[PDB]
Symmetry: D3
Subunit: 158 residues, 6 copies
């Protein structure tokens, strides 16, 4: 059984994240979608809300498990018996930062392999931050989010 972990803040999970986790499930037997509590980033949604939204949005994928965590990434990957860490590519700044995290994780857990996937062109210019900024100014973001997430975001801002 090959196990992969797809970590992030997912505040909230977008169609870009759904695209990446879907591609990961086609490659690995079991995928853990791991949501960091991230209190320092002051998230819009609590960890419990982010886990519930991601569980609903990924329910149609049989080999995805959604979990919350506050541990060091490398420790949580070891403790989930995962040997693959999935990241999505986007911008240069993200890529250069992903290279720093991958080299750090290699020092913390040498057998944990960083794997980068490319999202569909459709979602290659979106992020949780951009969707929230548009929604805060009442712009239509229905195209970018799963249905349950779009309702939760509208309710949170209401």
């Amino acid at each position: 059984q090959k196990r992969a972990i797809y970590p992030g803040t997912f505040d909230p999970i977008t169609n870009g994240h759904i695209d990446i986790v879907t591609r990961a499930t086609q490659m690995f037997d079991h995928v853990i979608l791991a949501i960091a509590a991230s209190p320092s980033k002051k998230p819009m949604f609590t960890l419990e809300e982010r886990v519930a939204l991601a569980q609903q949005a990924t329910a149609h994928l049989g080999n995805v498990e959604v979990v919350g965590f506050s541990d060091l990434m490398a420790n949580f990957a070891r403790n989930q018996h995962a040997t693959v860490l999935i990241r999505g590519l986007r911008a240069v700044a993200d890529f250069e930062y992903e290279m720093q995290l991958a080299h750090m994780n290699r020092h913390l857990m040498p057998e944990l392999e960083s794997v980068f996937l490319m999202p569909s062109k459709e979602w290659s210019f979106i992020s949780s931050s951009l969707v929230k900024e548009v929604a805060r100014h009442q712009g239509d973001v229905t195209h970018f989010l799963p249905e349950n997430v779009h309702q939760a975001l509208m309710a949170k801002l209401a």
Copy 2:
């Protein structure tokens, strides 16, 4: 009548911004310089101060109108009957972020066309943030700002 909108936080408007709006007035019949309230960025100058400084700095250009806004960018462009959105180029991080905003705006208002202009080499390495950081440590920033803006910045920090 071809109408263009040049949006930003302009906190405060610099000679780099004057250069871009001047180039835009040579291309389009009417240019709206649109200042976002931007409370989340905690601006140094209030919106009323930023509008007044920009009005004084652009008074010599007959086809510029300075306006403040708190709306979604795409909605404000539609409501001003503009079909061109002017941006200035600077760094890679800015460019990659401009590409995300342009693709989002295309989803919100397909007929709104993002147009990128290049500032003079003279202003290609300045920003409102950099000028404010230098001024906060008493460095001479007279070369980078219109006269009225330089006086207002010195007064604000005094």
Copy 3:
């Protein structure tokens, strides 16, 4: 304002990415010159006559586009055509760096010519005439990336 804009390139061959950029340019300027380089440094796959005829047929539906071959310095041709706007597409970071170096050079050569950068549809962001030609030469499907007339001409060129 009756603006004349120039959109220069080798267009070897013209792709849907080029059509996207020129269509956007016609929606903001009164007249657009699609300027095709006569003699690029590397021998083109299509001759200037073929490149011009392909671009003309592919832009015929846009009433304010003029397709014209040129052999001078791009800025010398733009000056003689009374163009005041120079159109270039920005696909990614590699485009951004190179285009900024050319724009500072063109501003030195012709200060009255303003460089305007447009963004193509996400559909054409990763394509270039070079990549399309390379894929087609190695027996890959490129139909989606080209106007029909160009697809037909490229198939005929690769058959021989």
Copy 4:
């Protein structure tokens, strides 16, 4: 899942950077095809027969690697080999831009082939076969960057 992955390139010659990437790929996929381009656009320093034999000897210790020459479009070969994973190494920003353009093209050509990007050790992040060959041609020491068999073959090639 019994995944077949393809790691394509010119491998002219195979370096320790390539060995690093293929070793990581064998640690996550059941079978890895190290696919060597038969006829690149620029004449290679080593013939296809030399490139294949060097890569075979340098990967012989990895039981689930198969070294194979190919002349078709990379995606056409991957489809015929039943590969569902495409392996590429990402060294720096220049790699990132070019690889993203190729990945969108490969997804159009073969949607069932997923591009997976791996990162080499810091030890090999700045090297390429091109830089190694250029340094060695101008009498610089490149022993550290190559498997022993490749070091021997490169010295013999440069001696004549």
Copy 5:
């Protein structure tokens, strides 16, 4: 006597910073390692703590002087009689920002020359921010910091 200044926030000084200051001492007769108070960045360590840690970490290098400052960079360089400003290279975002600072400093002090050095591959993916993020989640950062700094960081988080 050729004098160089190596400025930064050094919150805390890492092995990457030690590598850069060591390379600078091999090139220039006297190197001032200058620590900015940086209250706007809300540092983990006070300026007095950062100066003491850097003094201990660089004590083995005879031509390094550690000093704290709150002045404009260009003014502090002039006042130290330095004509060389040392920077370490890392990512594109850093490089583009270094180009803006270098062009600004050239306007403030034309004779002050910005010199960029490249750290060892060993430290090319680390930063003070990354080390602190790992340490805050109890990850082992002993490899990345001088001994005295590692003890101080563990004590600060305890």
Copy 6:
């Protein structure tokens, strides 16, 4: 400290951007070697004898510059010249990526040679000898970017 620095390149021809970098290097190091590559991969527009004479006349006002031709690996020449500092100019992001790959290679070849990167004036940030030559070949004005002697030599070369 009596530092010897090396500033290598093809200098085909030397531009005001090169003069800017070498002038800054003379203001921080006791002796600067302006090292000109004898045999680059692509045939240069100017012969080594022409490149050397142009660089000598253009740097004659700087007393601590020595112009010297070299054909070895740059690091082998730097070692034999007792240089401990290697000077390179950083114009933009494309320069940054390539220069970092060369600096790690040079550190492996000659660990005692420290790579030092300088920034040119904003006036010369977008220029290269390649862009200047291309503009001049296509009848564009490049007088502003070159020392007077180079402007004269380039006009004479393009006239024939």
